[PDB]
Amino acid sequence: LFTYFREAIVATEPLLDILVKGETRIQNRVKLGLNSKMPTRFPPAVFYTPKELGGLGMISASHILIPASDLSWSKQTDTGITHFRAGMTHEDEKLIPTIFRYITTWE
Amino acid sequence: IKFQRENWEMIRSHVSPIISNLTMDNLQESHRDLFQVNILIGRDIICKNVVDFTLNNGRLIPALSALIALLNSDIPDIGETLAKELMLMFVQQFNRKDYVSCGNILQCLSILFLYDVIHEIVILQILLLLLEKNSLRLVIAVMKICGWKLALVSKKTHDMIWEKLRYILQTQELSSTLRESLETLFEIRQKDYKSCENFNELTMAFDTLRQKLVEFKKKIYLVLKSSLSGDEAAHKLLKLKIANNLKKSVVDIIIKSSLQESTFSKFYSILSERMITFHRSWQTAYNETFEQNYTQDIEDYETDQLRILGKFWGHLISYEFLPMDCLEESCPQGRIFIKFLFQELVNELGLDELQLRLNSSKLDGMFPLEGDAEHIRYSINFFTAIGLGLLTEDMRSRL
Amino acid sequence: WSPTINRANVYVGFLVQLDLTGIFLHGKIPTLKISLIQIFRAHLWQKIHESIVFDICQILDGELDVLQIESVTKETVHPRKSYKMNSSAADITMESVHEWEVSKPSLLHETNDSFKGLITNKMWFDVQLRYGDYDSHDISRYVRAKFLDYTTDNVSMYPSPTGVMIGIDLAYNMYDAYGNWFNGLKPLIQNSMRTIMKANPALYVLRERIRKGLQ
Amino acid sequence: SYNGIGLKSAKGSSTSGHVQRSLASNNRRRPQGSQQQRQQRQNAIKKASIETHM
Amino acid sequence: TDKNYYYLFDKKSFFNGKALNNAIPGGPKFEPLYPREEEEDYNEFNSIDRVIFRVPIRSEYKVAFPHLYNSRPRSVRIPWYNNPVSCIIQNDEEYDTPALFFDPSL
Amino acid sequence: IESAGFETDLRLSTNGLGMCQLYFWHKIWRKVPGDVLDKDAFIPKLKPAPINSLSRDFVMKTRRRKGISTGGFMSNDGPTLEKYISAELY
């Protein structure tokens, strides 16, 4: 997804939303295996920690503070980046880096 | 005895001098000076000096009060004497219709009360006296001065005073000015004041007394990298609300991060822009960083990194920054950085337009206008090396 | 990730104690339990605890006359006492020759002490195993808490009011003890504990099992 | 949703639905002066430009 | 004791918010009653070509004048619109005193 | 204009201690700040405009609402002969 449209992701909010959702779903799959999904019992440690420290080693694009906007004025007319939405999880102020910042934008 | 007298005289003079001096700019110094000179044998003199000063700056009454308090803490007798003198003065004022004097004295008293020198009882008495003769102008300012304090200590007394004031306002044919004063007082209340034989021994005592008296960086990096657009990153940074000290450091870190990435990204530039718009301190920090770069940190970098940096700077400068730039000897890495920056500018702006913009700013370093004995030749050559105009024109101009 | 996945700060997990062990599971977590069982197969927890007790006894025997010890009685506790986390009991009761001047309830790693508070003729050691977990992995604190609880309320099957609660976090390999001490005891005790941690057979076995589980 | 801007609903989302207002927003708002830096320049560029009844 | 305190923390206000899918930031939030059918289709009404933006029209104002500021309100109850409560209680054990306020002119 | 959600806002601010009321019986009109008949005018579409161009923007909006101006961008001027007297003699 990201290597194909590196630069072009940032603007599209729907895609971002999907990523957030998709990532969460994936996480829950793992948590489904462990028959819980209790949000404390899976700190981001267990997912994003690499396999070389025993983690799953996911490559998140979910911890981004998504651009929210006036959906009144978004589809209509014009736009600007104001009010960020949550992004994906409760964090312990643990800023998980995002794959996009390690991919050189197409231009 | 003669010697003692002389000493006293000297002391008095010193006190007078201190009084004359006393201001906000050199208060500590004044205090120090005062401490140096004796005021047990020359206690009366000191008192006289203080009182005189009060009579004079009335605006620096608080300071005087503080000084008195300080003195009192050490030598209480002197303080007591001063208080007595003040009281006497007040009495005199009351007697003789010396209104200004009364006001001054009252203020002093209030100050004393505030600093735990004199009791609030005296103040209360004064207020009562003022009331008895229908003198609103005297008690109004005094009350204001020692209002909160009064409330704290003798609340009942304060209440009584308030009641009296109210009575005066309503159950007495008061003047317009008086009424106004009353109103003001009320307003203040609503907010609670918003605005010798043993000479040698003594000397010895006084002298004794005188003698007695990486993680952050990491976090920043994470923030930079845990963020989709630059905007988000900027927002995150701003959330942190780091001190005006560390802004420069943050900027430096950001720059480093940018350098680290393989090629120049719009992201970093965007972030910078966001920061810059946000506050003057961030702008200042950015400027500082820039200065550091071309001066001392530019020659350290490898080429690609340097180029990237230049590009970033160009982007910053194409719009957001003011074109302020400080540029034979200075030509290796630095020159290439400059070239890169120029290229970036060209890309952003448009050649002629860019040139015009450059002209508009003072700009002596990038394009020095004065010929200066074939020193501009080098600059021209450099310009030629990276496709540019106006250099030729400049050359023609000088001959 | 057991020590995060199973942990104390759970929202709604019904805390079952796992079979023949002191390993609380906050809710049915699937593979974890099996792994734990494998680790602690053949009553391993009990063995560990008992082994530790034995070691302590041996140590005491070695240093009898140095610390003025009349007799070192290992009490005949109920087999599950190792893994009864609610209650407790004095494992190694300890008779004195002369009267000990013990300190106030304090930790095993404390440089500053005062041996003029309480006095006693009899003492006890309790060994308390626990399986740690990310939230409550601090062992010392836990032991202190236990001491505060057990010693005070009604009767906690201790013959003397004064004693010590040794505690070994099996899942973090941390150890700490807390309680009352007499002069020269504490350093020795610490040393003994260290030795045990380095090499107790049961503990070693446990470690091996854990390794196997983890691969 | 607060000022037309929050995420419609907390469910589905797969997220807190928390909404920090951005501090880029402020920046975006504020460049009246920045417009003058450009606006001002523009202005400068184009700056120079009955009796019977009575 | 001041009743006016509960402005936009009324049950009615809450209900309105729920209806309008509009959180008073302090208060609760729910699944919207009605699904947000974003099918304006760039019409000549409510366009940004047409309207003016002196006021930001906060969602605070929505639940206060539901039928006005919000367009297509549904199942929206009417809120209250109140008087101010000058009520002074003495905490220092005193009796009938003009303390917090100021005296008449005459 | 500015008095949209004024009272409510005030109430929110003041924890319902101050109660505003707005009225218009003085019939007191006033110049909208800024200057109509300016084609440069303002920057923002979404935000509130600046005060020199405030008059203009409002007028434009009104025109749009009416259906006087035809399109996304337009102007206002006098219809007369001779190119409006040569743009008022330049």
DSSP secondary structure string, B256-323?
Answer: HHHHHSSS--HHHHHHHHHHHHH-HHHHHHHHHHHHHIIIIISTTS-HHHHHHHHHHHHHHHHHTS--
| Resolution to one decimal, Å | 10.0
Burial class of residue C151 in the structure, from the number of CB atoms within 10 Å of its CB (0-12 exposed, 13-18 middle, 19+ buried): buried
Q: Please tell me if residue F45 touches chain A, with a CB cutoff of 8 Å.
A: yes
* Residues β-bridged to residue C175: C168
- Return the closest-CA partner of residue B317 out of B279, B278, B363, B281: B363
Q: At what angle do helices B136-145 and B99-114 cross, to 10 degrees?
A: 20
d(CA B79, CA B68): 6
Burial class of residue B381 in the structure, from the number of CB atoms within 10 Å of its CB (0-12 exposed, 13-18 middle, 19+ buried): exposed
DSSP string, chain F: ---SS-HHHHHHHTTTS-------SS----PPSS-SS-SS--S-SSSPP-SSSHHHHHHHHHHHHHT-S-SSS-------HHHHHHHHH-
Touch between C and D (at least 3 CB pairs under 8 Å) = no
- Return the closest-CA partner of residue F56 out of F72, F36, F83: F36
Q: Given an 8 Å threshold on Cβ–Cβ distance, is A102 in contact with B225?
A: yes
Name the interface residues of D facing F (CB cutoff 8 Å). Answer: 29, 31-32, 35, 39, 42, 49
Number of H-type helices and E-type strands within chain B: 22, 0
Report the chain E residue with the minimal C-alpha distance to residue D8. Answer: E21
Q: Given an 8 Å threshold on Cβ–Cβ distance, is D19 in contact with A85?
A: yes
Q: Given an 8 Å threshold on Cβ–Cβ distance, is B186 in contact with E104?
A: no
Please name the residues in contact with A107: beta carbons below 8 A apart, sequence gap of 6 or more. A7, B266
Q: Nearest 10 degrees: CA dihedral of B218, B221, B223, B227?
A: -150
Report the chain F residue with the minimal C-alpha distance to residue D25. Answer: F47
Q: Given an 8 Å threshold on Cβ–Cβ distance, is A68 in contact with D13?
A: no
Are C88 and C147 a contacting pair, CB within 8 Å?
no
d(CA A1, CA A12): 13
The tokens for B242 are: 């780091």
Q: Given an 8 Å threshold on Cβ–Cβ distance, is E22 in contact with D10?
A: no
Are B312 and B264 a contacting pair, CB within 8 Å?
yes
Q: Given an 8 Å threshold on Cβ–Cβ distance, is E59 in contact with D2?
A: yes
Which positions in chain E touch B156 (Cβ < 8 Å)?
none
User: Angle at CA C123, nearest 5°, toward C120 and C129?
Assistant: 145
C-alpha count within 13 angstroms, C-beta hemisphere, residue B309: 30
Name the interface residues of A facing C (CB cutoff 8 Å). Answer: 33-36, 38, 40-43, 45-46, 54-55
Report the chain F residue with the minimal C-alpha distance to residue D49. Answer: F90
Q: Please tell me if residue D19 touches chain A, with a CB cutoff of 8 Å.
A: yes
Q: DSSP assignment, residue B134? A: T
C-alpha count within 13 angstroms, C-beta hemisphere, residue F47: 16
Task: Identify residue A10 by its one-letter amino acid code.
Answer: V
Instruction: Tell me the shortest Cα–Cα distance from F30 to chain A, in angstroms.
Output: 31
Residues 64-83 (F) with a CB less than 8 A from some CB of E: 64-65, 72
Helix (H) or strand (E) holding B344: helix B333-348
Q: Mark A73-99 as b/e (b = at least 16 C-beta within 10 Å).
A: bbebeebbbbbbbbbbbeeeeebbbbb
Q: Please tell me if residue B352 touches chain E, with a CB cutoff of 8 Å.
A: no
If one counts every other C-beta atom within 10 angstroms of the C-beta of residue C171, the result is 20
Are F76 and F63 a contacting pair, CB within 8 Å?
yes
Q: Mutate which of E1, E3, E4 to test chain F, going by most F C-beta atoms within 10 A?
A: E4
Are D14 and A21 a contacting pair, CB within 8 Å?
yes
Q: Mark B156-190 as b/e (b = at least 16 C-beta within 10 Å).
A: ebbbebbebbbebbeeeebeeebeebbeebbebbe
Q: How far is CA D39 from CA B362, C139, C141, D32, F42, in A?
A: 20, 67, 66, 9, 10
d(CA B259, CA B274): 19
If one counts every other C-beta atom within 10 angstroms of the C-beta of residue D23, the result is 23
Name the interface residues of B facing A (CB cutoff 8 Å). Answer: 219, 222-229, 231-232, 235-236, 261-263, 265-267
For chain B, the distance separating the N- and C-terminal CA atoms, rounded to the nearest angstrom, is 89
Q: Given an 8 Å threshold on Cβ–Cβ distance, is A89 in contact with D16?
A: yes
Q: Given an 8 Å threshold on Cβ–Cβ distance, is E21 in contact with D9?
A: yes
The tokens for A10 are: 């940032």
Please name the residues in contact with C80: beta carbons below 8 A apart, sequence gap of 6 or more. C46
Q: Please tell me if residue D31 touches chain B, with a CB cutoff of 8 Å.
A: yes
Q: Mutate which of D15, D23, D25 to test chain A, going by most A C-beta atoms within 10 A?
A: D15
Are B105 and B98 a contacting pair, CB within 8 Å?
no
d(CA E20, CA E32): 7
- Return the closest-CA partner of residue B136 out of B181, B86, B191, B190: B181
* Residues β-bridged to residue C26: C15
Which positions in chain D touch B273 (Cβ < 8 Å)?
27
d(CA D4, CA B333): 52
d(CA B164, CA B214): 66
User: Angle at CA A15, nearest 5°, toward A11 and A20?
Assistant: 115
Q: Please tell me if residue E105 touches chain B, with a CB cutoff of 8 Å.
A: yes
Whole-angstrom Cα Rg for chain F: 19
Largest Cα separation within chain E, whole Å, is: 68
The minimal CB distance from C5 to the residues A34, A54, A55 is found for A34
Q: Given an 8 Å threshold on Cβ–Cβ distance, is E49 in contact with F64?
A: yes
d(CA A57, CA D39): 51
Largest Cα separation within chain D, whole Å, is: 80
Q: Given an 8 Å threshold on Cβ–Cβ distance, is A81 in contact with D22?
A: yes
Q: At what angle do helices B333-348 and B351-360 cross, to 10 degrees?
A: 110
d(CA D51, CA B213): 89
- Return the closest-CA partner of residue C57 out of C209, C172, C166, C141: C166
Q: Nearest 10 degrees: CA dihedral of F48, F54, F56, F62?
A: 60
d(CA F59, CA C184): 93
d(CA C170, CA C82): 13
